[PDB]
Design a protein around this nucleic acid. Structure first.
Ligand code: ZN
Lengths: 91, 59, 95, 191, 84
RNA sequence: UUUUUUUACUUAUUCAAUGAAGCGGGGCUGGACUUGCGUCCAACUUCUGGAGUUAAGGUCC
RNA sequence: AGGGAAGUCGGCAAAAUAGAUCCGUAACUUCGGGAAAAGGAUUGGCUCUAAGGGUUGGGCACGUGCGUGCGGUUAACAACCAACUUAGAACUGGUACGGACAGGGGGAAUCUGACUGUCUAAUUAAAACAUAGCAUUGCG
RNA sequence: UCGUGCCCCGUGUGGCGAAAGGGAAGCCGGUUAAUAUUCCGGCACCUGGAUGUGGGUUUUGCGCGGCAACGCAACUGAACGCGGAGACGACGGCGGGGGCCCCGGGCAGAGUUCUCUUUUCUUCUUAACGGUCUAUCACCCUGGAAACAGUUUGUCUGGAGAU
RNA sequence: GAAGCCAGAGGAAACUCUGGUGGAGGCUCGCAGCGGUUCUGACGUGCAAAUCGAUCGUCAAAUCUGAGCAUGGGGGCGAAA
């Protein structure tokens, strides 16, 4: 039973701030309020504690991450090229 | 300050780290300590074997 | 290959899924193989390796997570570690 | 705010080998967009342990061992001198001079790129987040990775109250009155 | 009234160890032992020596604080310093 | 002997850090190149959210 | 009373509306709103009816109130206890039934500032100020 | 004891600053013209000190029991360390407890009473401090869950072991 | 009456529809509080060197407020009058 057709989580703002600004804030709110699968214990219990801080409710591990997502694409690419550079350095 | 007025067995649990750490965490500490010391002995043995092999190769 | 071998073992042989039952199998000494998932906590991983070293049981380190190991065992729940007690028709023990 | 975000002081262990610390907490710092990491090291000279406060790179977690020194591995969260890293490595909290405990690339989502090495005179060319190029001594330390909390400024503040909450813990001047809205006695733009 | 603190009255005030007495009189150990022999200052034994000093052993020597205070006024101290 | 230039130095002056803790130069050991033995470069801890502190010990008295 | 803005610079002031249940609700729109839009039907008293709950409690064979091994899901039954809502119906007084009190008048448009917010204490509360958003400049 | 010395340690620096923050400990009854958690009576508590008695422990020197979570009146513990408490936002609904409000019966008292009203109203209380038996979360043991299950008003939990 | 959640009906699925649940918002009617729009208002040597009445704005927050403390005239402070 869909109650709104497009505003979604941005319906709490009513008719204020502009359609484009509500649409822009919606993506960050959805990602920052979603639950994520923990990379240590595998359960779906990682939620944002503060900006950049993501905590797992089950295994109590706290991880430094992105502002509104648990991981940042720049950080993932950084990990990949870091692993390449580490292989080149060691070998 | 009310803890200064009651006896020692009421303020603790009769176990290592009792009244400061819980039973699960104490069990984890014991298992981790044993396994890490065993791994240290294993690494020392492997290092001695590698040193002996290097000495035999040099000699 | 390990996934197909696990499916064949699930179909034909006998397994136990989970940490406590895996420990019980290692204590009984009838465990033939132990599979440990990649994201298993390192303390539990070291404990399982020590138990298998005592019981002379082989250990396979499954490259997937506990979710992937449960899926490979054909279940709808996660599994951090599992024990094969009877290989059945598969050749998973010969490796 | 409890403690400043600095490296350990440059000592014998970091100059000649490495020292291991354990990340105990990842905490929010008011007025700062980036989270901080509390890391406990051993004191090489006494029994008591030392607690340090670093700027947390993305991917750091509680219970993680990080390594600081010349011989530390090229892994996220490790603190190495720039002479020990290859070209193209991105780092954070880079020291301008060795021992200043970190000055460059400190805010969320930012990093410093190691562009080149000149081993003859012991210099390292780096690229800053503003795009500027700089030469620093090669013994300056940096933490491998990118500062956590990136993408913070992508979300609109949307409300005067959220701007007020942002700046009240920061001491920055808010609200801001325009100079042209003022009388000539107050501002040169006044009137 | 105001709550007292532990270890500020009783035997902790009644007794001093030999180290505390020697530092209190600002003497060397031979001069202190000589003066105790000459003035009749005798070793004493508290009921609980931990209440006096937490580092005390069975070989720790104790004296009365009032006896040490009395030794503070002996004219031989200035004689010792004059001879030095 | 003096006037300009640059081109080194450190001792005045200036900046920073530390609990002023390991700087500089050798010796020992190992690795390389070299020359047929001088350089430079390395000693020491990386599976784990444990623990590390009151010197054990050797040898002359 | 009758008329109903003829008054007045100007509907100033007053009057009218008002609670709750039900029917129904346009343009415009940033699709969230507009909206209690608009426009309608009703409401007292009395005597009834219906609906919405809680607790307790199962047969054998042995050992001897518990243990077993059974057997059964019509307890879909009994006993006891309990409170406030909702709907339906008859009867009945009436000039009034949200009977005092309490309590939106509504609508068509134009200009204007995005909105919430703030200031000239003691003549100006506003198209003024702020605001989020946007743009530029300086600094390693 | 070469008697007039030697060893260990490192962290700095003092004070003021809150009758609403933090914080050791007191309740009830009575009493005055006027004070009362302050007086009086009864019944307690905290902090500090000294030193006894009983009880405990010990000839296996520093207790015993429970698989465990842990229990029991005791049941050594310096330096140097680790940890906890002090010690913490705003808002929303849900559940437990005290007090208040409300209903019924009973004893006693009071009012109403032309008529009616087995009536309307009032008293019916229990402190600190203790003992004892219990109280959501959570944790432990057995065991191993798909025909997935448990479960909140609110969809969370479970092979990292649920029911 | 926003996300999230449950059920039913569809849809190859993604999704769609229906009924509930839930309780978000510098949302809204409105009591106290805070403020101060209007009235040929009261008062005008006043109760008052700024008060009184009715009406009005706001009312879960950029809300109201105490104490302690800081900024001092070539200054301060100023959502700027
Ligand atoms: Zn986790």
């Amino acid at each position: 039973s869909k109650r709104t057709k497009k505003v979604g989580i941005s319906g709490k703002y009513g008719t204020r701030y502009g359609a484009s600004l509500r649409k822009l804030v919606k993506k960050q709110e959805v990602t920052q309020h979603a639950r994520y699968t923990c990379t240590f214990c595998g359960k779906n219990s990682v939620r944002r504690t503060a900006v950049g801080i993501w905590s797992c409710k089950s295994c109590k591990k706290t991880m430094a991450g992105g502002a509104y997502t648990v991981s940042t694409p720049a950080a993932a690419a950084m990990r990949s090229t870091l692993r390449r550079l580490r292989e080149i350095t060691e070998a | 300050r009310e803890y200064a007025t009651i006896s020692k067995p009421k303020k603790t649990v009769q176990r290592a780290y009792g009244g400061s750490r819980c039973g699960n965490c104490v069990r984890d500490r014991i298992i981790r300590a044993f396994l890490i010391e065993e791994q240290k002995i294993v690494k020392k043995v492997l290092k001695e074997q590698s040193q002996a092999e290097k000495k035999a190769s040099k000699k | 290959s390990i996934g197909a071998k696990l499916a064949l073992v699930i179909k034909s042989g006998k397994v136990v899924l989970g940490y406590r039952s895996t420990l019980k199998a290692l204590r009984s000494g009838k465990a033939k193989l132990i599979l440990i998932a990649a994201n298993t906590p390192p303390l539990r991983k070291s404990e399982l390796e020590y138990y298998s070293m005592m019981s002379k049981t082989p250990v396979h380190h499954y490259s997937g997570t506990n979710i992937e190991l449960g899926t490979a065992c054909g279940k709808l729940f996660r599994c951090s570690t599992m024990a094969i007690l009877d290989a059945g028709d598969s050749d998973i023990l010969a490796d | 705010r409890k403690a400043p975000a600095k490296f350990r002081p440059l000592d014998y262990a970091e100059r000649h080998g490495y020292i291991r610390g354990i990340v105990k907490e990842i905490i929010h710092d008011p007025g700062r967009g980036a989270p901080l990491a509390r890391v406990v090291f051993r004191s090489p000279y006494k029994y008591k342990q030392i607690t340090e406060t670093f700027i947390a790179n993305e991917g750091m977690y509680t219970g993680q061992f990080i390594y600081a020194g010349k011989n530390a591995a090229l892994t996220v969260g490790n603190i190495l001198p720039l002479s020990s890293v290859p070209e193209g490595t991105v780092v954070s909290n880079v020291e301008e001079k060795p021992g200043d405990r970190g000055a460059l690339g400190r805010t969320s989502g930012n990093y410093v790129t190691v562009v080149g090495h000149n081993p003859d005179e012991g210099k390292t060319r780096i690229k800053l987040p503003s795009g500027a190029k700089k030469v620093v001594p090669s013994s300056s330390r940096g933490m491998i990775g990118i500062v956590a909390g990136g993408g913070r400024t992508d979300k609109p503040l949307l409300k005067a109250s959220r701007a007020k909450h942002k700046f009240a813990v920061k001491r920055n001047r808010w609200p801001k009155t325009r100079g042209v809205a003022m009388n000539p006695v107050d501002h040169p733009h006044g009137g | 009234g105001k709550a007292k603190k532990k270890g500020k009255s009783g035997a902790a005030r009644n007794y001093m160890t030999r180290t505390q007495a020697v530092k209190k009189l600002q003497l060397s150990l031979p001069d202190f032992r000589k003066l105790c022999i000459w003035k009749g200052i005798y070793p004493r034994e508290p009921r609980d020596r931990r209440k006096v000093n937490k580092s005390a052993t069975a070989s720790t020597t104790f004296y009365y604080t009032k006896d040490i205070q009395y030794l503070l006024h002996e004219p031989l101290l200035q004689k010792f310093r004059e001879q030095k």
